Amino acid sequence: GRIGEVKRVTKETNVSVKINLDGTGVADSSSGIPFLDHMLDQLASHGLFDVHVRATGDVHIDDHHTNEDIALAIGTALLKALGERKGINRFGDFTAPLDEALIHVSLDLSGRPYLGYNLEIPTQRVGTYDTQLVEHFFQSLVNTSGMTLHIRQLAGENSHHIIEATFKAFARALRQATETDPR
Amino acid sequence: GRIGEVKRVTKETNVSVKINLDGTGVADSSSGIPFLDHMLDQLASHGLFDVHVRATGDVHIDDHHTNEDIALAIGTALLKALGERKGINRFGDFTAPLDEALIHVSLDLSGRPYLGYNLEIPTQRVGTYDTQLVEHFFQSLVNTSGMTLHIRQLAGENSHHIIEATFKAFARALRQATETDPR
Amino acid sequence: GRIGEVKRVTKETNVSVKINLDGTGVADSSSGIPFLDHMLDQLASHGLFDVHVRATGDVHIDDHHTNEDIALAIGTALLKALGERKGINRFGDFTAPLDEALIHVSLDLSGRPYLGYNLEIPTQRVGTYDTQLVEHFFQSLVNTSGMTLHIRQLAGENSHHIIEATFKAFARALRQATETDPR
Amino acid sequence: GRIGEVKRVTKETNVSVKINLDGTGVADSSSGIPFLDHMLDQLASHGLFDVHVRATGDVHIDDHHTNEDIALAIGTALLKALGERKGINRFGDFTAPLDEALIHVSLDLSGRPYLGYNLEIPTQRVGTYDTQLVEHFFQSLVNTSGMTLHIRQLAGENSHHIIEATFKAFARALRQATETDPR
Amino acid sequence: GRIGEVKRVTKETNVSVKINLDGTGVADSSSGIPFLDHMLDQLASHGLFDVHVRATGDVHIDDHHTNEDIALAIGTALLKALGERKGINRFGDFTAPLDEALIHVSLDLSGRPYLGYNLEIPTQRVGTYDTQLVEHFFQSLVNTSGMTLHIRQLAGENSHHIIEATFKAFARALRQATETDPR
Amino acid sequence: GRIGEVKRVTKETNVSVKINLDGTGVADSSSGIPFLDHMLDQLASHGLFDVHVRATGDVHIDDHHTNEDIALAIGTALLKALGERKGINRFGDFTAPLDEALIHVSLDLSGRPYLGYNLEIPTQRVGTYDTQLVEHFFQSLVNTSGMTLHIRQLAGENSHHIIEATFKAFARALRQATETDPR
Ligand SMILES: [Mn+2]
Ligand SMILES: [Mn+2]
Ligand SMILES: [Mn+2]
Ligand SMILES: [Mn+2]
Ligand SMILES: [Mn+2]
Ligand SMILES: [Mn+2]
Ligand SMILES: [Mn+2]
Ligand SMILES: [Mn+2]
Ligand SMILES: [Mn+2]
Ligand SMILES: [Mn+2]
Ligand SMILES: [Mn+2]
Ligand SMILES: [Mn+2]
């Protein structure tokens, strides 16, 4: 059905991205960022999107540049994939937990970008992943997607659980919005 | 489908209300209060109700009497159309964003009226519509409706957005509650 | 020279914007919001932009929708105008007083939208204009324009003064950024 | 160039002044207040004005009378020199440091007098110059001048450095404002 | 044009630095510190300096010794290149954004060294680069450069952004001060 | 007797004002601002001045420009009426109540502009009149008038009473100051 394909090439990065909204949950990501792939594999698995990401970047500097241009790419792919937005639910709201974590995501494929981020992560790094990037990821994805997106933390100690549960609750909500409403 | 109709006159106002719970979203409000029409036009447009309102009132004094009497009629009209309540969900739950605002609405078509209203609207006026009247509209609605309704502000700065996001949220939660569940 | 043009027709509004970055100071704005027109003439007179707005919207409900759609147009007109963005300054920075008022605007034409708004206006209305719409004007303008924009209140009592000083500093920095850098 | 000339004679003082907006840097000031001459020399040197001041007053009493009248004359001759204020930038904004001091100066040759003075000088006397008189010089300069002026201390420990940096940033921004703009 | 060159060899590092004040933005750094190279390309890119750096040091202990010997060299390369300092602006002042961040950077090539540094970086590492070394870099660069330099943070969450914004504003203000004034 | 006339035309207003310092209390104000007319009527009546105002302004936008330009015209009209200021009290000082309110005006015809304004008016509008304009009227009057005016709210709840009592007190002390002293 609905597939979005973007190939962006900056000085800093090389990003190839393919999203099927009406997928079966196929996860095939290789960004050079081990933890970000794991989050994108959740995105596929939990909202049954098919996600094909393939990137190569400044990883020697920071993770910052690659994190960002993948995120911007995914949002542009999301926009092309929704087409003219004919009869989709459009809104989606799901609270998913992971053990002690409990994350709430409400969103709306509005056309006007906004990221409400209320998410305190107590450690500065999960694996090698700078933990400030999760915010940056979602910001960049929202800015090209045109997606109004609030994310709210109700509970959580463990930083791995917190980001995983967020991506779990973002996927299930995103599907809810991409699916077709019997209008 | 399921339709409730109410004529209702007093010394102060004259009010007439036709509501289709199984409509297509035909918004048809002319109350003498431009702002309230707009919110009633979102009730229809998001809940897929057909909403017909016609009214004249003491607007030259206050919007108070007309906002209250319309609200009272709509709840009475909602009550008739629901009729026997045969096999409906009864409960609706929906959080809705409109940019920075984020409003949760939980309801239960119970028979016992309750408004839990937790909404701080920073400005006294949106257009020419007294901002205190958003609480009096849902309070009057609930009173004739036999509805149990909680409205909770989670986020919000701008007044238009907040009120509108409540009406968006409430409409999709009313729809959910009036629909038939494979019981 | 560099001219962006935008027509835009939504259910609510009918907007027609035309902006010349290399103008002479031509203000020709009639939107049906008298206050916004006066501000859009500060934009022209101080940025030496030629500005031509023409709009009709739901003024009877609110100024909100008309405010919003003009802003989204002005921001789009800007992005057509800039085109390739070759050999321009890219960064603006100007602090501007108007009597007791003092407003710092810093901007970067980056292709990534951000609003930093630290402006407490002590009255709900100047003329008939809802004061919350000043923020929504720059927010919506930024959202299509692709502009990183910080606005900073350093001083101000009079609400007319604060908004006017804002459009003065914005305009002069918009100029600094849009002009050619001897590269 | 543009030359202001003002000879004014109270009971208390005999002031003579000649400023040249389009000067070259010609420091020529004797006032009977050695520190103020050191500040007037910085005004000519950093703004590239040709400043000429010659004064006598009740110095045996206080530096007050003489400080005020010189300030009142410099303002007036600034005005006479501007004339019709045709084609000039008009606005000036500059932040100059001196060692640990850092003072920001925004002004506007506006026709309307105003002084915001946010400047804590920790000592009561630099040499023999009463430290309260710095405020009084820019206050009196501003009334006759019709200038809008904000002086903001962002850093500073040493009293000499604070005042001199204030005279440096005043100078450089005043230049900006008197300079022609290609309209 | 104005070129400074420096080879500085210690028991710890071998540092080679050529700087071109009147360049076209030539970036060319390999210091063994990936993030410092990125900040150097930003300096070369935004001041239109040409920046050639080559370094080998204790990167296996710390990044500290390399960080400091490189920046001490760069200050010295700046000082040779500047010469007698004839008819340059001397004062450079610029506030620059990078998304949520906003750093103001006022300086004066005075001959007397000073660093007012008011920057709170919320993480301890960008990439593998100690976040404390940013201050020490600007501190060393100031000591031999004979420069007066204030760096004020007005906003910022993301560390990468904060520092890159510091380097963007440092660059555009150094440009301003080394450029020639029509005197 | 002592008569001051002024015609002043801007791009926003057309103001004509005449004031007789030795009048008999004749009130002749049509300003486009019904509340300020009422305040000038008190100004004549309570100081026995003959006040003639006829104005035309942006009133569709704001009352701002019209309020300011009338204020500035009265001050120039006052300065002229006074001429060479020979044999007159110079200093006035009156405290006038209006019911619960109590204002203390204490002026000085100093040729030196200052306003002390220590008034807290608890509502945003008296009629259609923006309450902020009271300060701005008096600020603008003082700037072109060369008067030293202190306004002290000692008591007051109702805003109509506070502004009217200010104009009462202000008039009785302007009258006192302009009267002659057996010299
Ligand atoms: Mn009543
Ligand atoms: Mn009631
Ligand atoms: Mn709306
Ligand atoms: Mn909006
Ligand atoms: Mn004295
Ligand atoms: Mn004095
Ligand atoms: Mn060290
Ligand atoms: Mn970034
Ligand atoms: Mn970077
Ligand atoms: Mn204005
Ligand atoms: Mn004004
Ligand atoms: Mn009265």
Q: Three-state SS across D60-98?
A: CCCCHHHHHHHHHHHHHHHHHHHCCCCCECCEEEEEEEE
**A96 bridge partner residues:** A103
Query: How many Å apart are CA E171 and CA E42, to the nearest integer?
Result: 8
User: What's the CA-to-centroid distance between E107 and ligand 11, angstroms?
Assistant: 35
Backbone phi and psi for residue C103, each to the nearest 5 degrees, phi listed first: -125, 125
Report the residue from C94, C99, C154 with minimal CB separation from D148.
Answer: C99
| CB-count burial class (<10 Å; 0-12, 13-18, 19+) for C127 | buried
User: What's the CA-to-centroid distance between C38 and ligand 10, angstroms?
Assistant: 7
Report the residue from C124, C125, C160 with minimal CB separation from F64.
Answer: C160
Picking from F117, A23, A130, the residue whose alpha carbon sits closest to that of residue E161 is A130
CB pairs under 8 A between A and C: 7
CB neighbourhood size of A165 (10 A) = 26
To the nearest 10 degrees (0 to 180), the angle between helices F133-145 and F64-82 is 30
CB neighbourhood size of A88 (10 A) = 19
What CA dihedral angle connects E156, E162, E165 and E171, to 10 degrees? 130
**E15 bridge partner residues:** E8, E55
CB neighbourhood size of B39 (10 A) = 23
Q: Residues of C near D (CB-CB distance < 8 A)?
A: 24-25, 48, 94-100, 102, 154-155, 168, 172
Contact predicate A77/A23, CB 8 Å: no
Domain ranges of chain F: 1-89, 90-183
**D102 bridge partner residues:** D97, D155
Contact predicate E103/E166, CB 8 Å: yes
* B101: Cβ contacts below 8 Å, ≥ 6 apart: B153, B155, B156, B157, B158, B161, B162, B164, B165
Query: How many Å apart are CA F133 and CA F31, to the nearest integer?
Result: 14
* Best C102, C152, C176 residue to mutate vs chain D (most D CBs within 10 Å): C102
3-class DSSP state for residue B73?
A: helix
Query: How many Å apart are CA C164 and CA C172, to the nearest integer?
Result: 13
CB neighbourhood size of A124 (10 A) = 15
Q: How far is CA F109 from CA A150, A173, B44, D10, F93, in A?
A: 61, 71, 67, 17, 12
A and C in touch (3+ CB pairs within 8 angstroms): yes
Contact predicate A19/A29, CB 8 Å: no
F87: left (phi over 0), alpha (psi -120 to 50) or beta: left
CA atoms within 13 A on the CB side of D164: 17
Strands (E), chain F: 3-9, 14-20, 27-30, 50-56, 94-98, 101-108, 114-118, 125-126, 129-130, 148-155
Q: Do domains C1-89 and C90-183 have the same CATH topology?
A: yes
Contact predicate A160/A129, CB 8 Å: no
| CB-count burial class (<10 Å; 0-12, 13-18, 19+) for F124 | middle
Query: How many Å apart are CA A180 and CA A177, to the nearest integer?
Result: 8
Q: Cα angle vertex E8, ends E2, E10, to 5°? A: 170
Query: How many Å apart are CA D18 and CA D52, to the nearest integer?
Result: 5
D and B in touch (3+ CB pairs within 8 angstroms): no
User: What's the CA-to-centroid distance between D69 and ligand 6, angstroms?
Assistant: 9
Strands (E), B43-90: 50-56
Q: Cα angle vertex A106, ends A105, A107, to 5°? A: 120
CB neighbourhood size of B59 (10 A) = 17
* Best B45, B128, B157, B158 residue to mutate vs chain C (most C CBs within 10 Å): B158
Q: Render the burial of F162-171: b for 16+ CB within 10 Å, e for the rest.
A: bbbbbbbbbb
| CB-count burial class (<10 Å; 0-12, 13-18, 19+) for E26 | middle
Query: How many Å apart are CA B121 and CA B52, to the nearest integer?
Result: 27
Rg (alpha carbons) of chain D, rounded to whole number: 15
For A1-89, CATH gives: 3.30.230.40
* C135: Cβ contacts below 8 Å, ≥ 6 apart: B157, B158, C115, C117, C119
DSSP A40-95: HHHHHHHTT-EEEEEE---TTT-SHHHHHHHHHHHHHHHHHHHTT--SB--EEEEE
* D86: Cβ contacts below 8 Å, ≥ 6 apart: none
Query: How many Å apart are CA A154 and CA A104, to the nearest integer?
Result: 7
The residue whose two tokens read 């509502």 is: F123
Q: Is the dihedral of CA F35, F41, F44, F46 positive or negative?
A: negative
Query: How many Å apart are CA A107 and CA A115, to the nearest integer?
Result: 10
Ligand nearest to the CA of C139: 4
Closest-CA distance of chain F to residue C146, Å: 30
CB neighbourhood size of E132 (10 A) = 14
Query: How many Å apart are CA F44 and CA E48, to the nearest integer?
Result: 67
Residue of C nearest to F122 (CA): C123
Q: Kindly determine whether residue A124 and residue E124, on different chains, have CB atoms separated by under 8 Å.
A: yes
For B160, the enclosing helix (H) or strand (E) is helix B159-178
Q: How far is CA B45 from CA A180, B22, B25, B26, C60, in A?
A: 17, 13, 5, 7, 20
3-class DSSP state for residue B123?
A: coil
Contact predicate D91/D176, CB 8 Å: yes
Name the token pair of C50. Answer: 């030629």
Q: Cα angle vertex D137, ends D132, D142, to 5°? A: 130
* Residue E120 marked ligand-binding: no
Q: Kindly determine whether residue D102 and residue E106, on different chains, have CB atoms separated by under 8 Å.
A: yes
The residue whose two tokens read 């008309």 is: C66
Overall fold of domain B90-183: Ribosomal Protein S5; domain 2 (3.30.230)
DSSP state of E140: H
3-class DSSP state for residue C171?
A: helix
List for chain B the helix, strand, coil content (%; round to 5): 35, 35, 30
Picking from D67, D76, D59, the residue whose alpha carbon sits closest to that of residue D18 is D76
Query: How many Å apart are CA D57 and CA D73, to the nearest integer?
Result: 14
Query: How many Å apart are CA A160 and CA A101, to the nearest integer?
Result: 10
Residue of F nearest to C127 (CA): F62
User: What's the CA-to-centroid distance between E9 and ligand 7, angstroms?
Assistant: 16
Q: Is the dihedral of CA D106, D111, D114, D119 positive or negative?
A: positive
Contact predicate B75/B140, CB 8 Å: yes
* B66: Cβ contacts below 8 Å, ≥ 6 apart: B12, B13, B15, B31, B32, B33, B55, B56, B57, B58, B59
In this structure, chain C runs to a length of 183
Query: How many Å apart are CA E105 and CA E78, to the nearest integer?
Result: 18
User: What's the CA-to-centroid distance between F137 and ligand 11, angstroms?
Assistant: 9
Q: Method used for this model?
A: X-ray
Name the token pair of D161. Answer: 């450095």
Q: Cα angle vertex F92, ends F87, F94, to 5°? A: 150
Q: Which of the other chains make 3 or more beta carbon contacts under 8 angstroms with chain A?
A: B, C, E
Closest-CA distance of chain B to residue C92, Å: 27
User: What's the CA-to-centroid distance between B63 and ligand 3, angstroms?
Assistant: 19
Query: How many Å apart are CA C182 and CA C146, to the nearest integer?
Result: 24
Picking from F73, F138, F141, the residue whose alpha carbon sits closest to that of residue F103 is F138
Name the token pair of B145. Answer: 């409706």
Q: For chain C, give me the number of helices (H) and strands (E)?
A: 4, 10
Contact predicate F135/F119, CB 8 Å: yes
Contact predicate B74/B47, CB 8 Å: no
Ligand nearest to the CA of A130: 8
Query: How many Å apart are CA D142 and CA C154, to the nearest integer?
Result: 20
CB neighbourhood size of E61 (10 A) = 10
Pairing, β E27-30 against β C3-9: unpaired
User: What's the CA-to-centroid distance between E67 and ligand 7, angstroms?
Assistant: 9
User: What's the CA-to-centroid distance between B68 and ligand 1, angstroms?
Assistant: 10
Query: How many Å apart are CA D116 and CA C11, to the nearest integer?
Result: 48
Closest-CA distance of chain A to residue C75, Å: 13
Ligand nearest to the CA of C143: 4
Q: Kindly determine whether residue C135 and residue B158, on different chains, have CB atoms separated by under 8 Å.
A: yes
Residues of chain C in contact with residue A140, where contact means CB-CB under 8 angstroms, are 112
Pairing, β F27-30 against β F50-56: parallel
DSSP C100-143: TEEEEEEEE--SS-EEEEE---S-SEETTEETTHHHHHHHHHHH
Closest-CA distance of chain E to residue D105, Å: 12
Residues of chain F in contact with residue C123, where contact means CB-CB under 8 angstroms, are 124, 130, 132
Largest interatomic CA distance in chain D: 51
To the nearest 10 degrees (0 to 180), the angle between helices A133-145 and A64-82 is 30
Q: Residues of B near C (CB-CB distance < 8 A)?
A: 34-35, 37-38, 122-127, 157-160
Query: How many Å apart are CA D58 and CA E68, to the nearest integer?
Result: 57
List for chain F the helix, strand, coil content (%; round to 5): 35, 30, 30
Q: Residues of D near E (CB-CB distance < 8 A)?
A: 48, 94-100, 102, 154-155, 168, 172
DSSP F139-161: HHHHHHHT-EEEEEEEE-S-HHH
C and E in touch (3+ CB pairs within 8 angstroms): yes
Strands (E), D10-146: 14-20, 27-30, 50-56, 91-98, 101-109, 114-118, 125-126, 129-130
Residue of A nearest to C140 (CA): A112
Known binding residues of F for substrate are 12, 38-46, 64-68, 90, 112, 160-168
Backbone phi and psi for residue D87, each to the nearest 5 degrees, phi listed first: 70, 10
Query: How many Å apart are CA B119 and CA B170, to the nearest integer?
Result: 14
Q: Is the dihedral of CA B34, B35, B38, B40 positive or negative?
A: negative
Name the token pair of D72. Answer: 């009142």
Residues of chain D in contact with residue C95, where contact means CB-CB under 8 angstroms, are 93, 104, 106
